[PDB]
Design a protein around this ligand. Structure first.
Ligand SMILES: *[C@@H]1O[C@H](CO)[C@@H](O[C@@H]2O[C@H](CO)[C@@H](O)[C@H](O)[C@H]2NC(C)=O)[C@H](O)[C@H]1NC(C)=O
Ligand SMILES: *[C@@H]1O[C@H](CO)[C@@H](O)[C@H](O)[C@H]1NC(C)=O
Ligand SMILES: *[C@@H]1O[C@H](CO)[C@@H](O)[C@H](O)[C@H]1NC(C)=O
Ligand SMILES: *[C@@H]1O[C@H](CO)[C@@H](O)[C@H](O)[C@H]1NC(C)=O
Ligand SMILES: *[C@@H]1O[C@H](CO)[C@@H](O)[C@H](O)[C@H]1NC(C)=O
Ligand SMILES: *[C@@H]1O[C@H](CO)[C@@H](O)[C@H](O)[C@H]1NC(C)=O
Ligand SMILES: *[C@@H]1O[C@H](CO)[C@@H](O)[C@H](O)[C@H]1NC(C)=O
Ligand SMILES: *[C@@H]1O[C@H](CO)[C@@H](O)[C@H](O)[C@H]1NC(C)=O
Ligand SMILES: *[C@@H]1O[C@H](CO)[C@@H](O)[C@H](O)[C@H]1NC(C)=O
Ligand SMILES: *[C@@H]1O[C@H](CO)[C@@H](O)[C@H](O)[C@H]1NC(C)=O
Ligand SMILES: *[C@@H]1O[C@H](CO)[C@@H](O)[C@H](O)[C@H]1NC(C)=O
Lengths: 115, 403, 186
């Protein structure tokens, strides 16, 4: 059995005589985010392309280990992916959140007003 | 001299970023064969160099978007009251009714556009929701606060006065806008509808995606190449050979695949340089066309420029230019100057026009005759040096005061 | 990277030419010598291509810098957000190691106030249009001022002009404009 890449992905067992699937098992890359040697020493490893299967926090950018997840909005400091930014705020530890965009304020806009 | 005018909308699209990739040098070249890695380590730092180059491309990708779409620190939201001075802005502004925060044109564009070998792909830093939010904020800012929000704090201004200023910057008096604002509104709405229908193509975006796909596919297809050895599968070569003399086939495969990586990395660097140059140009266009009015000819659209409108697109940005163009023509007789009492006169800003019945003065872009006064002109020198001139009186508004 | 890449056998016996040219018979040294030559040439090619790329990038940045020097310094530029943040006044250059330093001096509005405006003004059934400013009113009367600095002024015939009746311009208001020439008539 082959694929678009003409690579073996389906085999027939001469004993059982059945359609067997082959799937890749070698995969993974390590990204390490730190708040800085001077500041502290706690770190939060990140895996680039694995489901959270192998304090975890699943994101579309991979499986993250060693960080607390909060809903509280904060300005983005360090990037990870998919609008997730980490920091060293509270004690102090590694946290993650959705990216924040400044502040919200509309304008008066009366059809006969000026500034 | 023109007598009528139409307002138009034109489009132009610019690429911003590509799809970042990442290829592991060692895991691609050799699979689970540990000894294949060992022989590679003789060659040294090639893998490290390639990895560093690709990471640099990856970070520059996000740098581009950060540069071209982050110009406002205050997320300005449109007030609930719609219909800004008679202009229908319903296709561009994101409707809260739609679940996805896009609007009609964004949806149309977004719909229109079409790992054991280390072909890892990373997501961008900013989600499409974020870029949509940027577009909405910029649109609201330039539609409610005029241009004086990219220079400081936003100031609310009615849309009519904003366009009235914009006319004043192109060389026409404020009379034209307030005299025919219903007509200009109807023409603008019709133009927006026409451009909405037109896209219902994107030649400058499907090109780069296809380029990257072709390059990656060539890499992947290069694996099956034998490269002058017994076979192509590393495991197969391992089984049927001996470690004492396995060096030949393994060495040849290493050389071939390494050379392939070299070529691919050079091509990727060239394409990245081109894309980043394009993104820089787009950023300049955003700074000039959007947050202000630029007098540079045929740069912020075609013809006299008034105001722009940005949007969002997959791996790109779509601009909407709003220009102003003369429509009809009517010939007239001209004269360099006019002499009244032996003293030469020159027009202040317009030009002398003679219908044949009499003489009149009007601006250069919209016919509007006026009675020749002493306030629309000024005097200097004699009438004996000008090449062409005609004899005609000049009215003085001081006469009624003599009663 | 180059100096490190020099010392690597590239699949040869060793990294020292003298050692190779001593241990092996000269008719047998050519294979090792050829391997070393190929490896070093490949590394040099990589380095030079990378350096050429970066030189091109720096040249592009340098043309950008030359344009900025030509425009911002040698006079003003209406190009908004090109010679700094906000409106642009001047610019002063400075020399730094392998680069330049620019000091943009700019103008930024500080704080504002609510105001009540109107497009045009009707005085004698015929409309009047401001020549450079806006019509604003704090409640008492109407005033004309520059676009971005509050300088109220008394509306005059020398401040506006007439273009027709007030029956078509929407949003107009009823008020009066003072003529300085009428009192002089006595
Ligand atoms: C300038 O051109 C526009 C576009 O045709 C004219 O607007 C039309 O005027 C006629 C005459 O009343 C109407 O029947 C149409 O409905 C108008 N719109 C269109 C789209 O045709 C306008 O009249 C022209 N300017 C002058 C001074 O006539
Ligand atoms: C061969 O396959 C058959 C059916 O799968 C099985 O019954 C038999 O034991 C197998 N014999 C050997 C020697 O593999
Ligand atoms: C750590 O940072 C603080 C303040 O940022 C500074 O005072 C201190 O000297 C730094 N220490 C080191 C080792 O960098
Ligand atoms: C991870 O695996 C679980 C178990 O099947 C599955 O429910 C989940 O959707 C997976 N997540 C991802 C991101 O693939
Ligand atoms: C704008 O045009 C659309 C097109 O049908 C219409 O549904 C909408 O009501 C219009 N909005 C205004 C304010 O006229
Ligand atoms: C230009 O317009 C005038 C109207 O007075 C007309 O007499 C003349 O023929 C026109 N020019 C041409 C080339 O037709
Ligand atoms: C304009 O051109 C005509 C054509 O010959 C000529 O007779 C006349 O003298 C010219 N006048 C001026 C002011 O150039
Ligand atoms: C204008 O009038 C003067 C006064 O008689 C005359 O000398 C001159 O020739 C006239 N210009 C013409 C006819 O172009
Ligand atoms: C502002 O209003 C007050 C009272 O309504 C008035 O005395 C004052 O003259 C107004 N401002 C100006 C600049 O006239
Ligand atoms: C401004 O909006 C209000 C809301 O009804 C309306 O009464 C008023 O006429 C509008 N003014 C202008 C100049 O359009
Ligand atoms: C302005 O005054 C005229 C003349 O008395 C009147 O007809 C018109 O309704 C007035 N308009 C306003 C807005 O006061």
């Amino acid at each position: 059995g082959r694929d678009i890449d003409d690579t073996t992905d389906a085999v027939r067992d001469p004993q059982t005589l059945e359609i067997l699937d082959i799937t890749p098992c070698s995969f993974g890359g390590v990204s390490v985010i730190t708040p800085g040697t001077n500041t502290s020493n706690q770190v939060a490893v990140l895996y680039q392309g694995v489901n959270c299967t192998e304090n975890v926090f699943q994101t579309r950018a991979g499986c993250l280990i060693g960080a607390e997840h909060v809903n509280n909005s904060y300005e983005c400091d360090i990037p990870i992916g998919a609008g997730i930014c980490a920091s060293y705020q509270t004690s102090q530890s590694i946290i993650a959140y959705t990216m924040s965009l400044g502040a919200e304020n509309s304008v008066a806009y009366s059809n006969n007003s000026i500034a | 001299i023109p007598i009528n005018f139409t307002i138009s909308v034109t489009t132009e699209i610019l690429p911003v970023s590509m799809t970042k990739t990442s290829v592991d040098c060692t895991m691609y070249i050799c699979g689970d064969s540990t000894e294949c890695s060992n022989l590679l380590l003789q060659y040294g730092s090639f893998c490290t160099q390639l990895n560093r180059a690709l990471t640099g491309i990856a970070v520059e990708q996000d740098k581009n978007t950060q540069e071209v779409f982050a110009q406002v620190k205050q997320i300005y939201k449109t007030p609930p009251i719609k219909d800004f001075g008679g202009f229908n802005f319903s296709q561009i502004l994101p409707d809260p009714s739609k679940p996805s925060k896009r609007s009609f044109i964004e949806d149309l564009l977004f719909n229109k556009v079409t790992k054991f070998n280390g072909l890892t792909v990373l997501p961008p830093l900013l989600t499409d929701e974020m870029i949509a939010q940027y577009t909405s904020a910029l649109l609201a800012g330039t539609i409610t606060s005029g241009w004086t929000f990219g220079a400081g704090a936003a100031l609310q201004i009615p849309f009519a006065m904003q366009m009235a200023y914009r006319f004043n910057g192109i060389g026409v008096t404020q009379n034209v806008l307030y005299e025919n604002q219903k007509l200009i509104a109807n023409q603008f709405n019709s133009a927006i509808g026409k451009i909405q229908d037109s896209l219902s193509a994107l030649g400058k975006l499907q090109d780069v995606v296809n380029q990257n796909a072709q390059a990656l596919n060539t890499l992947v297809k290069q694996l099956s190449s034998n490269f002058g050895a017994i076979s192509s599968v590393l495991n197969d070569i391992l089984a049927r050979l001996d470690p004492p003399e396995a060096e030949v086939q393994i060495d040849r495969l290493i050389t071939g695949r390494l050379q392939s990586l070299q070529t691919y990395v050079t091509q990727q660097l060239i394409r990245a340089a081109e894309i980043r140059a394009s993104a820089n140009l787009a950023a300049t266009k955003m700074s000039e066309c959007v947050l202000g009015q630029s007098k540079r000819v045929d740069f912020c659209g075609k013809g006299y420029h008034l105001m722009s409108f940005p949007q969002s697109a997959p791996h790109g940005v779509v601009f909407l230019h709003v220009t102003y163009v003369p429509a009809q023509e009517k010939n007239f007789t001209t004269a360099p100057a006019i002499c009244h009492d032996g003293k030469a006169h020159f027009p202040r800003e317009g030009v002398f026009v003679s219908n044949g019945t009499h003489w009149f003065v009007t601006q250069r872009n919209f016919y509007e005759p006026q009675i020749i006064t002493t306030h629309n002109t000024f005097v200097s020198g004699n009438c004996d040096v000008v090449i062409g001139i005609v004899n005609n009186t000049v009215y003085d508004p001081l006469q009624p005061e003599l009663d």
